[PDB]
């Protein structure tokens, strides 16, 4: 399948080159992979920059804050990348980049709304959660965030970088 | 198994060297994740030399084709597109994409741009409206002729392709 | 598994042989023209071999594998081995006229046995009717009354039909 | 689909030489085979260095918890544990097992102490007495503490599982 | 697993020149077990190839490819039938080499056909196998077309006196 | 998944002497099990050899497989019970050398063999169980016999006692 | 999975055969390429086949046999664990002398039960020869002991003749 460039195969030279993907749906093994490569780009230095590609329908919650966490934690600043779409759990990860280094291509869309085993009170503290995230990294209100979040609808880049998920959207080919 | 050639690669490894990016069959996330990983190595090797793009697809979905097309946008290199077998809804907009006067077909291939047969009516409405926008942008098309073309649900031949502006050469020659 | 000696398949893609074995698909038309671009960059004058076991398959595939042999300026052999089935024996008669062979025993269909409109399928029919006419050189008519008969004809009668050169007498 | 790092590694070995090692997803004898092995190798190399323990696991078989942790308690290393995401049921025992001030939590993991629910009832019993004693070794409360806790199906907050002893440091950022 | 002696088991017996047909016969078999006798012409048109068969048969127009390089190639070609050669791998075992086809005591061998396309179709690729077993038996088309339709295995001496082996192996 | 560490985490295991029973045993087991144990005899015959031990057994002839083995090659074997021993594992666990068979404290024994072939063929198959334990435990085939059909498990402390095995080792 | 040459490859090269499992037509195939292969590498050093097998299908084991039965090699033969149906043929026809078991092995003769009844009888009457040559019982007793659907010890084995010896380790 994955092709071989010279020897490596291709996600591997990315991640030779600090690239992290993070594609397709979020589980505890997506996760496992991102945390691990996260953990491992920090080790091998600190200070230069880590981009993370995004293109995701979100997923798991635990998975997504697990990501989270440790972007947050890691020393290096982070570049995230929307390609495609950033949805749910996705948007999270690319509102989680460092401020000024968080940048989207011009058709993707991007989803705030958290689409629809455990009991209800354990699922609204998560959500509580995602609230406080939401609002530190757009610096909205969570009044704003609340209902922002109950509308089910993709955003446009344009609206995502007023709404504060993104800084820059790179128009120029 | 993929045969090995001659260092000893398999043969889409070593089409790669070539700088020949393969997009077969159909489109999801996982293609549009090697498609974009290829695409982006291609670059690191050179700037300026084209990039071969060889569309055998019957397209797929709509966001992991536009994540395509956003990176055969933001490279700087010339993408010579080759539309071989078929190119059918996201398929002719990566046909498309190619750059002016490097965008080709084969003599038996069909050109579609409909699109065809989870998701709210306004978003595929919201995808749909991009759709004919970057039709008309890349075939210089009014944006009722593209209105009206996908809304056909036909094949055209290279030649109707060549007229209508998807394609540039159709190399009936060998 | 596959035995070693490179795998069997890299051995003989090194003397030039390109086996399309079973049914064709995007998968198996990837795989063919790719190893057609391949050996005409290897050398752009020694001929190809193109061995043929196939009970056709997706007819967009086949003409994907018949537009590159047409497009590289090699001669082609084509061998039927066991059967051409539909697009199998396209491909088989678009070998290089005099360089398309059959085994004794191979049977060739020309027949097309049995998500798209009619009118669309109609239209690829059309263009197969072109293909045969011009290699075999019969009448639209005949093409069209040959392929709507399902059945196998000998290599012998396909010899006399047109889809082929030579029979390998033992 | 597994990444290599450059003589070349996937990153899991990588990591290895790390001396971490990753409890990630459920826990079954196959994951306890292999997180034992580990732990018996990376005692080998050095039995004074710390060995990191990164888990996040909605648990899974207590036998084969069990014989991770008693794994843990064998060897002489230092063992720091994280969580990330969650540790939940037998993956809040190999949290809790970690070295004392050595078991650390990302903000925003999920802690549940609760077992949520092929053999006779008296050895389902039995099992339960044999963690009630381990967390009482470890988190210091009694046992009528654990087993009212125990008993509500519930995830705490990582500060309340540092009040009930599960932890013994939230990190936001490195110190 | 296979084992490896660096060859796996299978790799070093085809430089002894040896191509194992066993299990049941179809495009896929048919496709390795051409390769592997085009390979062994090339490295040599003179020493002989050892067919070793062991299947219950299988697709007829694959048993057919086999058979036509077998035919087609210049060697000589022993067949070894081991533990059975049933329908379509007993025309493989026939086609050997006169005075070459081989057969340990304890083998089964059945040229009946046991039990998609035209009827007409499949009587004129039956015709064919008439006319294959007829040449290589030195038997008449009568006698092949009474042998066929019986439900039955012979024995390794029956199958050497109608004329499908030429050698028993004794121990 | 397995990690590697010139090994698989497995192999490097294998050169220091220690053999992984791991998960159930069956027939695909018990040849790569016989195939270890035969392989560390060739490289000495006086080295001891580590058996580990998580299972819940399986099938029995699998098993005295195994066990036949163990027995033949002249090595010691240390046997170790980690997590569970139950039905056949625990039978492997008592096959040990005595004095060298071990437990973590916190292990489950099984002698019970938890419920194809003739009825009478079974109960054949089991009276040779009968045997095998009765030569290991030293207890009496009374004892063996009434011990088995108490379908429960029981803590290290009592299989020490039983005589299943000969060290606990209690925890630091 | 396995452990590491594989343990397998290891094995063959003491010239060790191991049948362990169902017998089919592709345990068949690899076991006869093995058994072929060590001839070659001498006819004269004696090669050691490993049977834990329920059997299986009977015209995989008879090929299996005959190529016991033709290479020169002497065979020994060791049932470990069980040796069922045609699993006990290919231990009755290793060398004399030279076909053990260890001591709680099982051994049956019996033939547990796409093709026509009377084309299953050909094959059961070439079984009977086979197990009459080798155990040296007659006809009539092999003939006997195949219907009772039992299994025997190691020792009421050797009786039978199926074993020479039993490995008392």
Redesign the interface.
């Known amino acids: 399948?994955?092709?071989?460039?010279?020897?490596?195969?291709?996600?591997?030279?990315?991640?030779?080159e600090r690239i992290v993907?993070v594609?397709?749906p979020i589980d505890?093994?997506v996760?496992?992979?991102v945390?691990?490569?996260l953990?491992?780009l920090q080790?091998e230095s600190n200070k230069k920059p880590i981009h993370m590609?995004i293109?995701?329908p979100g997923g798991v919650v635990?998975?997504g804050?697990?990501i989270?966490?440790?972007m947050?934690?890691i020393?290096n600043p982070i570049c995230t990348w929307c390609?495609?779409?950033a949805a749910s759990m996705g948007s999270l990860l690319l509102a989680a980049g460092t401020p000024g280094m968080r940048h989207s291509?011009?058709?993707?869309?991007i989803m705030i709304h958290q689409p629809s085993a455990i009991?209800a009170?354990?699922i609204m503290?998560?959500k509580k959660?995602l609230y406080n995230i939401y609002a530190k990294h757009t610096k909205q209100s969570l009044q704003v965030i609340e209902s922002a979040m109950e509308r089910?609808?993709?955003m446009s880049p344009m609206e995502a970088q007023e709404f504060g998920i993104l800084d820059k959207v790179?128009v120029h080919?």
């Not at 092709?3 to 990315?14: H, K, T």
């Open positions: 399948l994955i092709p071989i460039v010279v020897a490596y195969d291709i996600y591997s030279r990315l991640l030779r993907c594609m397709g505890d093994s996760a496992s992979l945390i691990a490569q953990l491992f080790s590609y293109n995701s635990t998975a804050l697990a989270y966490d440790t947050q934690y020393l390609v495609g779409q291509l011009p058709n993707s869309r009991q009170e354990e503290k998560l959660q089910d609808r993709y790179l080919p």
